[PDB]
Every structure is written in C-alpha cells, then in structure tokens.
Write a protein that binds this DNA or RNA. Structure first.
Length: 894
DNA sequence: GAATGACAGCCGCG
DNA sequence: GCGGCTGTCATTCA
C-alpha cells in the first residue's frame, strides 16, 4: 500500500510524524525538515517560481526551520514580503505526500473514551483534578474492544468488582442491559487503588497510543482531568507519557503532541447542522438513536456507592452511545477524508482558514507558484446579506425561490480574487444599479456594485480553486448516482436469479452498466449477485462522503475569505461579494415583480413579499385568482398548477433577468440560478390562511411541496416564532404550534376554540411543562449577599430566590453557572421573597420547597407571558382574533 | 453577521 | 404609572 501519515508535529528543528508504512504497520520518525521560502527578485534572475501576481520569486532553502522563522522576522524588520508556506508541517506534508492519498481507516487507531470521577463537593474541575478517577472505559477501534478500568477502593468507597453477567441481564432482572453486540468485546480490569489504575492506564496508552482521540467532551474534561490528576500524583514528567513524543502544551485544554483530538461534541456541532437545544450525550443520543445514556437513581455523586454495578455499566454505555452515533453520522470518517484531501493535521478539519489555505497551497505549489505572505489586517466590519422588511400580514399562497450556492457562485461569476483586482469605478447608489438606471460601470472588466472591477481575461486563484471543488462535487455525485442505477440492476437481479455457481463480475459501478455487462449479469448465481450489490453499495457510500466533503468546503470558503487571518482575505473583495449578492436578490425581485404584473395585467403590484440573503417569497394570490380558486378539483390540483407556472413561466423570466444583470456588470460568467423551493397555501375549500409573517426572520407557512417532492400531509414550516425557541415551556411550545397549525389549515374559528380550551385547561398542566427554560450566566456578578444586584436578569434573580430558600442544605440540587434553569413566577406574598424562582433543568424542584412552589406559582402571569403574549404576536400579524369579541380599534395607535 | 424579543433601568410628565 | 429608549442577555437563522 502507499504510505500515508497519521500525525505530524513541529518540535524545534524536527518534524515528528506517525505514519502507516508500505507494509501497513504504524511508525514514527523524526525528520530534520528543510523548508523553502521565497523573496521577490529582479527580472534578470531566471526562475520557475512566481507569485500569484506574476512577479518573479527566488527560492530560499533553509538549513532548518528555525532559520526559516528567523528569516521571516528579518524580512518583516526590513519591510519586504516573505512569501511561502510559513506553516512547515503543511509544507512538510505537501512535500512528503505529493499525490492523492488513499488511506486505510482500519490501520488508524481511533480511541473513544470516557471517565468517571466521584465527587461529593461540586463539579470536579479538570484543573484541580482533586478527586480520584474511579473508572475508565477506553474503546480501541483496532482491537475493537472496550477496555474498562474499575477502581475498587476510593476515599469514597470500597466496592465489589463489576459483574458482566449482571450487566448483560434486562432492567426487570436487575441487569444493566448492556447490548449483546459489545458484551463479548468488553475487557474488565479492577484495581486496589487509583495509583495502580492510572499507571496501568498510562501503560496501556503507551502500548496502544491513539491517533484520533474522541469521545463526548474529552477535550474539555476527560483529557485535562486524566492529565492533571496523573501530573499531581506522579510527576509532570509522567503525565507527559500521555503524548507519544512526551510533549504537552497547556492552552484549560491540554494539547498532546502526536495525537489528534476530535471531541465528538465538536464534530457534532460542526457537521450535523441540526441546532439542538442541548448538547449533552443523553439528549443528542436519544435524538440520533432513540435511546439515551443508562438510567440511575439518586445523584451521580452517590451512584458509585449505592450501585457501583450500574456506575460501571453507565460508563460503558456512555462510550458506546458515541460509537453508535458515529456509526450513523460517520463524522470521524468524514474528518479523516477531509484531512487527507487538504493534506492537514486532522484536527484542522475544524478550521476553514487552515483547510482552504492548505488546499490552495498544494494547488499553487503544483504550478510552481508561491503563495502570498499572510499579512495582518484590522478587523473591520463590512456589509452583509440583504433582508427585506416584510409587511406583517397573512399570505394565502406563497412560492419561494432560492439562488443556489450564492456566495461561491458570485466569486466565480465576478471572478473575485486578490490578484484579479483591476480597478474601481465611481459608485452610484445601490438602488440605481438595482433598477438599471446607473451607468454601465465598465465594458472592459467584470464588476461589483461596491465599486470593484476584476479582470475577465484571467482565472483568479480563488475562483479557479473553488470551481475544481464544484466540479469534483458534481463528479462524485455523478459516481454515486450510478451506484444507484447499478443498484437495481442487481437488487431485482436477485429476485429471479438462475442457479449457476460463479463469481461476481468486474464492473465500475461509478459508470453505468454497459450491455456487455448488463444482461451477462442478470443470469448469475445467488452467491454472486448478493456480492454484486455489495460493491454497488460500498461504491455509493464512497460517493456520498466525497460529495459531502466537497459541499462542506464550498460552503465554508466565504467564511475563510471574510476572515482577516486568511491568507487571501481582502476587505475590498469580501465587500464585492456581499454587495453583489445584495444587488442580485433585489434586482431579481424587480424582475419577478415586473414579469408577474404583466402576466397578470396588474400595475406596480408587489408580488415578492420577502427576501432573505438568497431567497425570495412570492405571493401567488393573483396567479391563483386568475384561474379562479373554484375551478380546482382538490388542493393537489392547484399545487400542481403553481408548480408548472413556476417551471415553465417564472424560471425562464428569472434566468432571462439574471442573464441581463450579468451583462450589466460585465461579469466573466453567468452563474445566478434559482430553484423553486416551497409551495404553501391553505387546504383547498378550508378557512385556513396558509401562511404569515410577523417580521424579519419570523414566519410560518403550510407547505405542500418542497423542491418537487409532494408531501402526503402538509408540513408546517415555522421560522423564528417561539415554537422554535428552547426557552419556551414544553406544553406551550406545543400549543403555540397547534395554534399555528389551526390558523394556516383550519382558520380563525378553529383557533379560537383551541385557545379557550387551553386556558380553561392550563392549571391542569404539569408544572415542569409550563416552566420557562433559561441558562444562567454571571449568576454571581448579579447577587449581593444572596440578593439580586443592579441590572439583574429575571432568571438570575430567580435563582437567588432558590438559593435563599435552600441555603444550608447539601441534599438540595445546586444551581451552577452555565447550565440551564427552569423559571417560574410566584404570586405576591410568597414565602420565597421575590417574583420568580428558578431551579436546575431536567430535574424536579426539591421536595423540601416543592409543595409551596406548586402552591404559590403565578399561573396567570405564566400563561400571559409565555403563551398569550407571543400568540397575540402571531394573530396581529395575521389579522386574526384568538378571542371572539375583540375590538377592531385595538390595532390602531392611539 | 442581520435580527428579534424579554427585561432592567433612566427619562420626561402638574 | 408608562411610552420611548438604551443597554444586557438569551436564541435563532443566512
């Protein structure tokens, strides 16, 4: 196999690398890497090297990396650009591995681990690591085993060994229900004391040092803990054995040289794009697997004594959940994939600046071009996306259209790049350009409304670099589109397979099956066809990953581009992009309004009701009324109608218009393409209103079709309203949705009935479902002797009413800083001395105050403030009454 | 970023 | 008091 790297570090004048060699065994080597950098030279000096601007550069090969850095400092001290890749690990990686790297994930040691630390006095700070580590479950992907380290004796308890038979049993039998698919993979190791345990762990770690270290929150707790604990008990010298190169750096995040840490909690917050209200392994675990972490009774701090059997099983299942999630989401793989693509240390996968730099670097390197020295830049804010102010109201029929990959496309269309800047032009006001009344900026260069002018005669580095990715995206998606076709020509080729013992043919499922190997296949045994589709899958699976990676770079490029720490950052350019986009969305709004006014005979009617960055929402009321609502059989009939109107009437007008704008700004290439996204309206023959907007980023639509796919039942698309906020009490968060559903699909009368009913039934709801949820920060900065200080928030003042109601109690759950807290208003004259009273979330109020809380809680204020207030918000905008007998005059200002 | 809403707290008011 | 506002927090949505 072709060698590939595992980790790379720069220690002094040496590069330390862990890699898989020719035979496939893990190795480490120290290399006195000699980097090259470049300085500008005169035209005379012949040379193959040039900077992105064409100017000639001379290669300077150094004796070692320190001289390289030293030189970069003198160049700065003089005032002359020091060109070249300053991050030598990157250069070293680009040098040692210049060829697409094909990696064997079965040879990379990927470790997931979690520890347990019985602490009776509050969360155990990793920096103190003041308590014993009573358990460690460390799963190793290479051995595919769960190595468990159980501490038997601790200042907090001596316990029996953990039982595996018991762990295997069911809940009802007293077992811990550890899945049978890992039950034989566990390796238990109990110890007499923490020292014997840590030293054995430290040893195990040396015999199986991780390459990829993951787990839930390992970078913020597990690692810093184990590190500090070992450091405090044995020497710091010993705690360093945790690094294969014996080196560590304390940022409290311990960085271990020679290891890549992809905290799974961060890999989730990155590549899942599913903003969740909580990031606890339990919450996220239920979400992805419909099963959470093991359940136990009492407080964790007392679980090791009370039930050490469940304690150890809990630690094993915790590590196992993460593995399951990743078995689904595949993020570690995605990370490996992307890291080797750009030739960077896997952890850099988290950095777009770092990722793109390395990609553009290796590309320009292949052309003997040298990259610019990254200059320092003031962080200066510039304009961003355009968002229209919607007229608050109900909207019966709406169709939205989305510009595809807007920002990367604008980069390509205008050809925006640092080295393709060609000048500027007098900038007229942005509206003038939106209406084509401003003077054509230039008929020589490709322009942008902010005043920049780019060359059209050359391919900018950024544009070229982003286009390859777009192409590769298309390419791979192409491959795995065939892995599909070829999927059926093998899936049904097994429903009626002859009985001829043979072997699976040799075809490239990336490319559609030919006839020579299309029917020659639908006549093989059964032992082959079932393998025929094993290759069809693996292939397809491969496609998805590359295609997903490509999509992630494309969408992150602008991120890097707008960042002042990016090598190609340029305020002028960052602004060319966003302003251009700003013009695009409004110009096309102008066209859509014009086209629809003509094909409707109306005059100056505002069809586009809303736009946000790359989206426009068009009202279709008129288009529907042209055909007369009555002439439609069912709901599905008009949904079909609008779909066609869009595809054969609107989209062509759109392209035609965008096509005009391209010529107007003299752009290198027309890449502004729109897609019809949603189609919403109320159920035909119903009193439903279909949709409404209360303001920017705040709306709800009853959608029937999204990008072509027709739903069985309409799906509510709600953006920004309280139903989407986690601070809203469960019961309310679901009644508000029911209110919106009744409004869009059923109408005012339906809504009013639910409302009345909900009020009538509010007090019968469980006090936790109707409690607000909030996170407490600066909980101390606002209290003075247990009381609310100056500018003290509502949830925080609340916490202090809880504190001054349980002060002097250790069996009562404490409100820590950061974590979420339920909040509730109390009637005046309550024993707690204040308006609100919070307490930790996910828990029930301590029974020592509970009965009085359930008593004094101000249902009225609660209802009004969390339910009625926000609904009134929705109903006002939708011109609806959630209560019969309401006055029309209320909607007027004085 | 471009934006929104819950709340605190300081006006200006016979 | 309370509309008008300004600043602090808490949470979403491109």
């Amino acid at each position: 196999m072709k060698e590939f790297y595992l980790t790379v570090e720069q220690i002094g004048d040496s590069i330390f690398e862990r890699y898989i060699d020719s035979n496939g065994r893990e190795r480490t080597r120290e290399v006195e890497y000699k980097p090259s950098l470049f300085a500008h030279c005169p035209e005379s000096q012949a040379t193959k090297y040039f900077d992105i601007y064409g100017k000639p550069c001379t290669r300077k090969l150094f004796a070692n990396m320190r001289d390289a850095s030293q030189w970069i400092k003198r160049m700065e001290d003089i005032g002359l650009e020091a060109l070249g890749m300053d991050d030598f690990k990157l250069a070293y990686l680009s040098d040692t591995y210049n060829y697409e790297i094909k990696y064997d994930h079965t040879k990379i040691r990927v470790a997931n681990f979690d520890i347990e630390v019985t602490s009776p006095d509050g969360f155990p700070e990793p920096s103190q690591a003041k308590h014993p580590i009573d358990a460690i479950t460390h799963y190793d992907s290479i051995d595919d085993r769960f190595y468990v380290f159980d501490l038997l004796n601790s200042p907090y308890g001596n316990v029996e060994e953990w039982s595996i038979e018991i762990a295997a049993k069911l809940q009802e039998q007293g077992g811990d229900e550890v899945p049978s698919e890992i039950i034989d993979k566990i390796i238990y190791m109990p110890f007499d004391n923490e020292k014997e345990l840590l030293m054995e762990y430290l040893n195990f770690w040396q015999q199986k040092t991780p390459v990829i270290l993951t787990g839930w929150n390992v970078e913020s707790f597990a690692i810093p803990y184990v590190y500090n604990r070992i450091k405090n008990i044995f020497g710091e010298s010993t705690a360093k054995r945790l690094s294969p190169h014996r080196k560590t750096r304390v940022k409290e995040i311990i960085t271990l040289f020679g290891i890549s840490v992809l905290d799974y909690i961060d890999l989730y917050k990155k590549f899942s794009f599913t903003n969740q209200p909580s990031y606890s392994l339990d919450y996220i675990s239920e979400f992805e697997l419909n099963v959470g972490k093991l359940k136990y009774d009492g407080p964790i701090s007392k679980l090791r004594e009370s039930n050490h059997q469940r304690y150890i099983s809990y630690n094993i299942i915790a590590v196992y959940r993460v593995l399951q999630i990743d078995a689904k989401r595949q993020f570690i793989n995605l990370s490996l994939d992307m890291g080797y693509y750009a030739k960077i240390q896997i952890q850099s996968v988290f950095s777009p600046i770092k990722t793109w730099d390395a990609i553009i670097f290796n590309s320009l390197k292949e052309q003997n071009k040298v990259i610019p020295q990254g200059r320092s830049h003031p962080v200066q804010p510039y304009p961003g996306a355009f968002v229209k102010e919607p007229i608050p109201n109900r909207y019966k029929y709406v169709m939205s259209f989305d510009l595809t990959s807007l920002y990367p496309s604008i980069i390509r269309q205008v050809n925006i790049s640092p080295e393709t800047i060609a000048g500027t032009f007098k900038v007229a006001p942005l509206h003038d350009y939106i209406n084509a009344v401003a003077e054509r900026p230039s008929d020589v260069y490709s322009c942008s409304p902010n005043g920049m002018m780019y060359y059209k005669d050359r391919d900018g580095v950024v544009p070229t670099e982003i286009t390859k990715v777009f192409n590769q995206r298309k390419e791979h998606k192409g491959y795995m589109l065939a892995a599909q076709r070829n999927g059926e020509i093998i899936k049904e080729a097994l429903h009626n397979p002859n009985l001829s013992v043979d072997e699976p043919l040799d075809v490239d499922y990336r490319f559609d099956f030919s006839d020579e190997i299309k029917e020659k296949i639908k006549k093989l045994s059964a032992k082959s066809l079932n393998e025929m589709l094993f290759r069809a899958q693996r292939t397809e699976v491969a496609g998805m990953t590359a295609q997903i990676n490509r999509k992630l770079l494309i969408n992150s490029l602008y991120g890097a581009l707008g960042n002042v720490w990016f090598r190609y950052y340029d305020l002028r350019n960052a602004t060319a992009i966003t302003t251009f986009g700003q013009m695009a969305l409004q110009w096309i709004e102008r066209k859509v309004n014009e086209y629809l006014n003509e094909v409707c005979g109306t005059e100056g009617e505002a069809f586009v009701l809303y736009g946000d960055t790359d989206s426009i929402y068009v009202s279709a009321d008129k288009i529907i009324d042209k055909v007369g609502e009555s002439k439609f059989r069912d709901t599905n009939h008009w949904v079909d109608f609008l779909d066609k109107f869009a595809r054969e009437r609107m989209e062509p007008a759109i392209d035609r218009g965008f096509r005009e704008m391209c010529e107007y700004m003299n752009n290198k290439q027309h890449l502004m393409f729109m897609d019809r996204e949603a189609i919403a309206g109320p159920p035909l023959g119903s009193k439903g209103i279909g949709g409404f907007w209360t303001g920017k980023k705040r709306y709800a639509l009853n959608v029937w079709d999204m990008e072509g796919t027709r739903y069985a039942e309409p799906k509510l698309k709600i953006m920004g309203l309280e139903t989407q906020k986690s601070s809203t009490p469960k019961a309310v968060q679901k009644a508000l949705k029911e209110c919106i559903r009744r409004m869009l699909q059923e109408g005012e009368e339906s809504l009013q009935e639910y409302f009345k009913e909900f009020e009538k039934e509010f007090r019968q709801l469980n006090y936790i479902s109707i409690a607000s949820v909030s996170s407490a920060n600066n909980i101390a900065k606002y209290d003075v002797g247990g009381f609310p200080g100056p500018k003290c928030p509502f949830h925080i003042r609340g916490i202090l009413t809880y504190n001054r109601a349980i002060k002097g109690n250790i069996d009562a759950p404490q409100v820590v800083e950061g974590e979420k807290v339920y909040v509730l208003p109390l009637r005046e004259g309550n024993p707690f001395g204040d308006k609100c009273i919070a307490w930790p979330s996910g828990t029930e109020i301590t029974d020592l105050i509970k009965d009085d809380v359930l008593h004094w809680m101000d249902y009225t204020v609660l209802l009004e403030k969390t339910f009625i207030k926000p609904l009134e918000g929705f109903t006002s905008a939708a011109k609806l009454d959630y209560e019969k007998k309401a006055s029309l005059f209320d909607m007027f200002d004085f």
